Design an enzyme around this catalytic site. Structure first.
Site, short mmCIF file in Angstrom:
data_model
loop_
_atom_site.label_atom_id
_atom_site.label_comp_id
_atom_site.label_asym_id
_atom_site.label_seq_id
_atom_site.Cartn_x
_atom_site.Cartn_y
_atom_site.Cartn_z
N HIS A 296 0.79 -1.20 0.00
CA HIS A 296 0.00 0.00 0.00
C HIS A 296 0.83 1.27 0.00
O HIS A 296 0.31 2.35 -0.23
CB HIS A 296 -1.10 0.00 1.08
CG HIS A 296 -0.64 0.14 2.50
ND1 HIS A 296 -0.03 1.28 2.98
CD2 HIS A 296 -0.83 -0.66 3.57
CE1 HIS A 296 0.18 1.15 4.28
NE2 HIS A 296 -0.30 -0.02 4.66
N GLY B 200 2.94 5.88 10.52
CA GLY B 200 4.35 5.57 10.23
C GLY B 200 4.84 4.18 10.63
O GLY B 200 5.92 3.77 10.25
N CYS C 85 3.67 1.25 9.81
CA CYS C 85 3.53 0.20 8.82
C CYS C 85 4.85 -0.39 8.42
O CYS C 85 5.87 0.32 8.35
CB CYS C 85 2.86 0.71 7.57
SG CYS C 85 1.11 1.02 7.75
O1 LIG Z 1 1.98 3.37 8.51
C1 LIG Z 1 0.84 3.42 8.05
C2 LIG Z 1 -0.40 3.21 8.92
C3 LIG Z 1 -0.17 2.28 10.12
C4 LIG Z 1 -0.87 2.66 11.40
C5 LIG Z 1 -1.44 3.87 11.77
N1 LIG Z 1 -1.92 3.71 13.02
C6 LIG Z 1 -1.63 2.46 13.42
N2 LIG Z 1 -1.01 1.80 12.42
N3 LIG Z 1 -1.49 2.57 8.16
C7 LIG Z 1 -1.79 3.34 6.94
C8 LIG Z 1 -3.27 3.67 6.77
C9 LIG Z 1 -4.15 2.44 6.52
C10 LIG Z 1 -4.00 1.83 5.13
C11 LIG Z 1 -5.10 0.81 4.87
C12 LIG Z 1 -4.98 0.20 3.47
C13 LIG Z 1 -4.91 1.24 2.35
C14 LIG Z 1 -3.91 2.37 2.64
C15 LIG Z 1 -4.06 2.92 4.07
C16 LIG Z 1 -3.01 3.97 4.32
N4 LIG Z 1 -3.26 4.60 5.62
C17 LIG Z 1 -3.46 5.92 5.85
O2 LIG Z 1 -3.93 6.39 6.88
C18 LIG Z 1 -3.12 6.93 4.82
C19 LIG Z 1 -1.92 6.89 4.09
C20 LIG Z 1 -1.68 7.88 3.15
C21 LIG Z 1 -2.63 8.90 2.98
BR1 LIG Z 1 -2.36 10.29 1.73
C22 LIG Z 1 -3.82 8.94 3.72
C23 LIG Z 1 -4.06 7.95 4.64
#
Ligand SMILES: O=C[C@H](Cc1cnc[nH]1)NC[C@@H]1C[C@H]2CCCC[C@@H]2CN1C(=O)c1ccc(Br)cc1
Ligand SMILES: O=C[C@H](Cc1cnc[nH]1)NC[C@@H]1C[C@H]2CCCC[C@@H]2CN1C(=O)c1ccc(Br)cc1
Lengths: 306, 306
Positions: A41, A143, A145
């Protein structure tokens, strides 16, 4: 003596953490040999993640798209495939740290150690369990991930988790290192919920044995139960049924205390039906399930202090 | 989201852990530069240790007596001397994994990570607090002597603890890296007790702040208190006096949550008086005092849920 949830020492895993950037998005990666794994992702923009087509999105990107930093040092990316949810980035240098390792898919009820990272830089290590609903109650911020979970046997690291996302409950989901999610979860930013969770019975029993070994015997009774009749009861209370293997894994704590496994089951059955009022165990009202038979055996071992 | 006991990455310390043998006794040593530190009691036979004079015991010994190994490799001892409790063995090699480090004496109430070892080999890492009575509620088995406690900032490891013994109650006692014990203890095999312990009031308040930051609020109320009327309640429940200096330190967390320090004390005062009604705070049924403000800030988001 003393009871503590412990993490495996995180050093061997620390030498594999790197930073991976694609666009304005940065997240961690795991550099083993000449390959860096991260969540795929990473290639998504805010619009893409709603309904992404990862083959389509991948075909657009070039090795350049990805910046990979190991400390200060820059790592040329020379290749990219996608395995399930993960990206496999081939790079111009083979990690001289990389430890003897393997990828194992962990099982509900097992524990592991999580090295929380941010911008490829390790921040801390904590204990964990894979819940029966296939999420974990971790501690993670934006961050995190790409952070990984692991266990060490001898010198060999068994990597078992890579972090992808937080659900609305506040629990966490991700994949094994072959990219296949734990649970039904998909890598799309959409309402997804944790299924109804279950208590881990095997660990509750181990805890009851810790409690007995740890100077406590008020729960215990003389009531007799079969495995079947215990299991019917466990389920109506959302406890995992106890398997044959679980009975075996408790064998050593049974020998150490001389409380037969089934008798400890009759203890726990009484606690579920009657409650535990106004009584505590190891200073807790409620039952702990994320401390394993293995944890209890190791910490106690090895003499009978009595 | 989430909140967990969480240790510093142990890698930098794992590369300083070695094994020291004197006669038939093996324990762990800390290898910095050319210098290995371990507990001095490694010299002692069974008779010696009941009433041991350490200057005499040491004067008989030579560099030859002590075997130090780092992994497979042998390290020749070419010097030895006693600083307080701990030996300083000088060796013919300088640890190339030596990290930027320093030595600190930790204050009651503060925390640190413990890298528990056996035969120079790291097995676990967990977080501890130095208790007001100067003893740590750790998890150690025999062979664990010489394991150390530490915090990390950036590059620098501040080592604050080296483990020496377990008291009859099951709590642990040790020294700093100058070898001066924490507390009233001495390094002889005789029963020793610690003073009456006290709950760390600053830490409970940080932990309550953590709960709120993670979106959990049931225990808050509209009430407030004077600092003094609050301290009057602390004393009844054997909590530590809260001071203004301690109040100041909670200033960042107070701002973040919008909950004035004196209001959180009202919350706590109510909890202590009425208990919890079988509820939980960050999944515990007991008020948690082994998280510092710093521990909370480092791990929580800098914005609150809601
Ligand atoms: O490290 C990443 C986090 C991990 C996390 C945060 N709190 C606890 N763990 N996860 C990223 C998330 C979820 C993910 C789900 C699948 C599709 C892509 C998203 C992408 N995320 C964003 O919030 C997201 C990313 C980019 C934009 Br611009 C807007 C929103
Ligand atoms: O790793 C060392 C342990 C640490 C520990 C064990 N459980 C939790 N932590 N502590 C060593 C103890 C206490 C120490 C007190 C000062 C004088 C030397 C003793 C020596 N110890 C032995 O039990 C002891 C050692 C050898 C003989 Br032969 C007889 C008695």
């Amino acid at each position: 003596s003393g009871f503590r949830k412990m993490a495996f020492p995180s050093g061997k895993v620390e030498g594999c953490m790197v930073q991976v950037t694609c666009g304005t998005t940065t997240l961690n990666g795991l550099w083993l040999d000449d390959t860096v794994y991260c969540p795929r992702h990473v290639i998504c923009t805010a619009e893409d993640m709603l309904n992404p087509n990862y083959e389509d999105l991948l075909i657009r990107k070039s090795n350049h798209s990805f910046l990979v930093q190991a400390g200060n040092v820059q790592l040329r990316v020379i290749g990219h495939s996608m395995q399930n949810c993960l990206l496999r980035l081939k790079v111009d240098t083979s990690n001289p740290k990389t430890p003897k390792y393997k990828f194992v898919r962990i099982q509900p009820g097992q524990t592991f150690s999580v090295l929380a990272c941010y911008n490829g830089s390790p921040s801390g290590v904590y204990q964990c369990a894979m819940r029966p609903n296939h999420t974990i109650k971790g501690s993670f911020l934006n961050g995190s991930c790409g952070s990984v979970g692991f266990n060490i046997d001898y010198d060999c690291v068994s990597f078992c988790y890579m972090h992808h996302m937080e659900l609305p409950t506040g629990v966490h989901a991700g994949t094994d290192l072959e990219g296949k999610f734990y649970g039904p979860f998909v890598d799309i930013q959409t309402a997804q919920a944790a299924g109804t969770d279950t208590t881990i019975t095997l660990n509750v029993l181990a805890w009851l044995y810790a409690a007995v070994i740890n100077g406590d015997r008020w729960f215990l009774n003389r009531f007799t139960t079969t495995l079947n009749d215990f299991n019917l009861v466990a389920m109506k209370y959302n406890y995992e049924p106890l398997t044959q293997d679980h009975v075996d894994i408790l064998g050593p704590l049974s020998a150490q205390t001389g409380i037969a496994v089934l008798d400890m089951c009759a203890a726990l059955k009484e606690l579920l039906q009657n409650g535990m009022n106004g009584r505590t165990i190891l200073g807790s009202t409620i039952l702990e399930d994320e401390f394993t038979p293995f944890d209890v055996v190791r910490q106690c071992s090895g003499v009978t202090f009595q």
